[PDB]
Amino acid sequence: AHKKAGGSTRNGRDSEAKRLGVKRFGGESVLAGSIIVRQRGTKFHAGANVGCGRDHTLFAKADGKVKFEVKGPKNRKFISIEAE
Amino acid sequence: AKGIREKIKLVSSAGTGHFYTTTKNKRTKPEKLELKKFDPVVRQHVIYKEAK
Amino acid sequence: KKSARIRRATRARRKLQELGATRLVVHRTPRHIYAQVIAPNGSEVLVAASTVEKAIAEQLKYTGNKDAAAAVGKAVAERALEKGIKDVSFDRSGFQYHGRVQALADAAREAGL
Amino acid sequence: KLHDYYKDEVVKKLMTEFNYNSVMQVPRVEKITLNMGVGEAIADKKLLDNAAADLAAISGQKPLITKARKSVAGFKIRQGYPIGCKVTLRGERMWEFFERLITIAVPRIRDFRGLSAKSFDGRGNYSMGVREQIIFPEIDYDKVDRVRGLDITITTTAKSDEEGRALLAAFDFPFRK
RNA sequence: AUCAGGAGGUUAGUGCAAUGGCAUAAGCCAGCUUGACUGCGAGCGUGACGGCGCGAGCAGGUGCGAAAGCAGGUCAUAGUG
RNA sequence: GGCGGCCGUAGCGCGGUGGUCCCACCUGACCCCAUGCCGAACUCAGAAGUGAAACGCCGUAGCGCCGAUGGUAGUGUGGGGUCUCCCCAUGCGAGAGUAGGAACUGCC
Numbered sequence: 001a002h003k004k005a006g007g008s009t010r011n012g013r014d015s016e017a018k019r020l021g022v023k024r025f026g027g028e029s030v031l032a033g034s035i036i037v038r039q040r041g042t043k044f045h046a047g048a049n050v051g052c053g054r055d056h057t058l059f060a061k062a063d064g065k066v067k068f069e070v071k072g073p074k075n076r077k078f079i080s081i082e083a084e
Numbered sequence: 085a086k087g088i089r090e091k092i093k094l095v096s097s098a099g100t101g102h103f104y105t106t107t108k109n110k111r112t113k114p115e116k117l118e119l120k121k122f123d124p125v126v127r128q129h130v131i132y133k134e135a136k
Numbered sequence: 137k138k139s140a141r142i143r144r145a146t147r148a149r150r151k152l153q154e155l156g157a158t159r160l161v162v163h164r165t166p167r168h169i170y171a172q173v174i175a176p177n178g179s180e181v182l183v184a185a186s187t188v189e190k191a192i193a194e195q196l197k198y199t200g201n202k203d204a205a206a207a208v209g210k211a212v213a214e215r216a217l218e219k220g221i222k223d224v225s226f227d228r229s230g231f232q233y234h235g236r237v238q239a240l241a242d243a244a245r246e247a248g249l
Numbered sequence: 250k251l252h253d254y255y256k257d258e259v260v261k262k263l264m265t266e267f268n269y270n271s272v273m274q275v276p277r278v279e280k281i282t283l284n285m286g287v288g289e290a291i292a293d294k295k296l297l298d299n300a301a302a303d304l305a306a307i308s309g310q311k312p313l314i315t316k317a318r319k320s321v322a323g324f325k326i327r328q329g330y331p332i333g334c335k336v337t338l339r340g341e342r343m344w345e346f347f348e349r350l351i352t353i354a355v356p357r358i359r360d361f362r363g364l365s366a367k368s369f370d371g372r373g374n375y376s377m378g379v380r381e382q383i384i385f386p387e388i389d390y391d392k393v394d395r396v397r398g399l400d401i402t403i404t405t406t407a408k409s410d411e412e413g414r415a416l417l418a419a420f421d422f423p424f425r426k
Numbered sequence: 427a428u429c430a431g432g433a434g435g436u437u438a439g440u441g442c443a444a445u446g447g448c449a450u451a452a453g454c455c456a457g458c459u460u461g462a463c464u465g466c467g468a469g470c471g472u473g474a475c476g477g478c479g480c481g482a483g484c485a486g487g488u489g490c491g492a493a494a495g496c497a498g499g500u501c502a503u504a505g506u507g
Numbered sequence: 508g509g510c511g512g513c514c515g516u517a518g519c520g521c522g523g524u525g526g527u528c529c530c531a532c533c534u535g536a537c538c539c540c541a542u543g544c545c546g547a548a549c550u551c552a553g554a555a556g557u558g559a560a561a562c563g564c565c566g567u568a569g570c571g572c573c574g575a576u577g578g579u580a581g582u583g584u585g586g587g588g589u590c591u592c593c594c595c596a597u598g599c600g601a602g603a604g605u606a607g608g609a610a611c612u613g614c615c
Contacts, residue, residue: 003443003444007444008444008445009444009445009446010443010444010445011444011445012444012503012504016471016503018470018471018472020469020470028468028469028482028483029482029483030468030469030470030481030482030483031469031470031480031481031482034470034471034481036446036502036503037480037481037501037502037503038481038501038502043154063482064482065481065482067481068446068447068502069137069446069447073137074137078156107462120460121488121489122463122488123463123464123487123488124464125464125465128487128488129488138447138448139448139449139451144449144450144451145450146450151494151495152494155494166550166551166552177514178512178513178514179511181510181511198552200551200552201539201551202539226492232540232541232549232550233492234540235540235550253534253535256534257533257534257555257556258555260556261556261557270559271557271558271559272533272556272557272558272559273532273533273557273559273560274559278547279547280545280547282429282430284429310544310545313544315544317427317428318427318428320427322427323427324427326427332428333428335429336544336545337544337545338544338545338547339545339547340536340545340546340547341535341536341546372430374430404430406430406431
């Protein structure tokens with residue numbers, strides 16, 4: 001029923017995440033990168049996470065959220081190639 | 085499997101449509117009251133009735 | 137990210153910011169009704185008109201009714217079209233339906249917005 | 250009428266000679282809860298009728314029957330039993346029933362005292378004590394069977410015993426020492 | 427037991443193991459309602475390999491909404507040949 | 508008080524002082540409109556009474572958070588000895604401690 005044995009986190013296997021979409025090349029508005037699911041907001045390049053900063057770039061495409069609270073889950077403001 | 089349990093598998097019946105639809109129904113009332121409007125591969129908005 | 141104080145009060149709208157346009161705020165006081173065409177990045181007011189200013193034209197009755205709310209909408213919008221704005225979204229933070237805010241919006245469209 | 254002067258006139262006067270503070274906090278609006286005298290015990294299936302059939306003449310609307318939260322405890326309580334029956338609401342009504350209640354009909358009972366004991370001690374909710382036979386200017390003399398005697402409460406947010414009851418003796422008398 | 431006040435980011439609760447998320451809430455109460463739609467593609471699983479799954483479109487059209495929009499079942503990762 | 512500009516060191520506690528211009532509290536619910544039980548919510552109307560919640564100013568830095576002047580442990584990377592272990596070269600440098608900041612700026 002409950003949970004016992006004063007223990008912390010619960011484990012299993014190896015993570016199933018990747019680094020798809022380095023971004024500096026074309027990219028249709030879709031989930032750039034993969035780690036955890038369910039998240040929206042970013043509609044372009046919005047790599048911004050606590051640290052030395054983050055980035056992405058060039059690619060004119062309406063929308064394009066991130067994975068979730070990970071590699072810059074925050075939603076910055078627009079960005080395209082330079083001249084789409 | 086089959087017997088005396090909640091879930092029960094029964095197919096719909098749009099009427100003239102080619103049937104097909106999977107929807108179970110536990111014993112907790114209501115009983116005789118399939119579901120409602122469905123759109124089988126055929127004419128738009130056709131009758132329903134998962135009961136059989 | 138966490139929900140900002142403004143998001144907790146849902147008075148703001150991030151979905152209208154993803155487009156990159158302007159708003160049409162409708163403030164209401166038990167005495168006067170205000171309307172503005174503010175643009176993102178702070179409180180940038182392009183055009184605005186108060187029901188009290190409607191008296192400058194020739195308003196006689198009270199300024200806290202529905203017919204006055206529609207009069208202000210036509211004024212704020214008329215000045216907006218003179219500014220150079222065409223489209224705008226309705227932003228009525230906290231209010232009911234069919235109220236004075238709807239009369240303000242219906243008035244804005246009547247002008248050309 | 251004689252209910253407006255209180256809260257604009259006789260609220261500043263009673264906050265100048267023995268207060269020296271702001272204008273609020275003493276005394277607002279907010280509803281006033283009117284409870285009922287335990288209906289349980291008395292009799293069986295009834296009395297709930299001669300109830301809401303008397304508490305619908307002194308004021309408006311009818312009482313609502315509500316049960317408790319289905320959760321058994323260390324007491325004889327079954328699931329699905331009507332206990333309580335409370336309904337309190339306001340707006341501007343709870344103002345007149347502080348006029349036609351303590352002015353006429355009293356003095357005019359049959360054996361009223363005059364001296365009351367220190368009801369409350371360290372709060373605000375005063376208290377009371379009335380008998381079953383009452384003479385009201387809004388009740389018939391010969392047609393009502395079974396006399397009903399209900400209490401009278403008042404909710405206040407005071408801080409000290411004094412600086413209070415100095416507003417009660419401003420209309421609702423008597424009160425000797 | 428219940429009612430009134432105060433303190434109280436939250437240690438509560440959120441179906442299920444654990445972490446993570448959340449309070450003018452994704453939690454509670456109430457009302458209403460019910461997208462678990464059809465068709466077809468692009469992408470994701472170092473290094474090729476199916477079923478299955480998921481994220482993101484388009485075409486038409488169901489439900490709810492003022493609308494954007496939200497569903498391809500139950501917040502995500504076990505409940506299958 | 509109105510009207511702008513810059514536009515996250517402005518979290519969270521605490522002190523003094525001023526305005527009957529402005530503004531909420533407040534007051535009143537005739538009516539539009541509205542509460543499953545309650546004009547409280549919701550919506551309308553008037554201004555008797557304050558500034559007590561706001562606001563304008565201005566004084567403490569507690570605690571959070573963001574920068575700066577001083578320094579040893581800690582730690583890469585490559586050769587030395589030595590029973591283990593320790594040392595040298597080279598790129599940097601815990602926490603404790605001394606200070607900084609409680610808005611800024613134009614016009615009526």
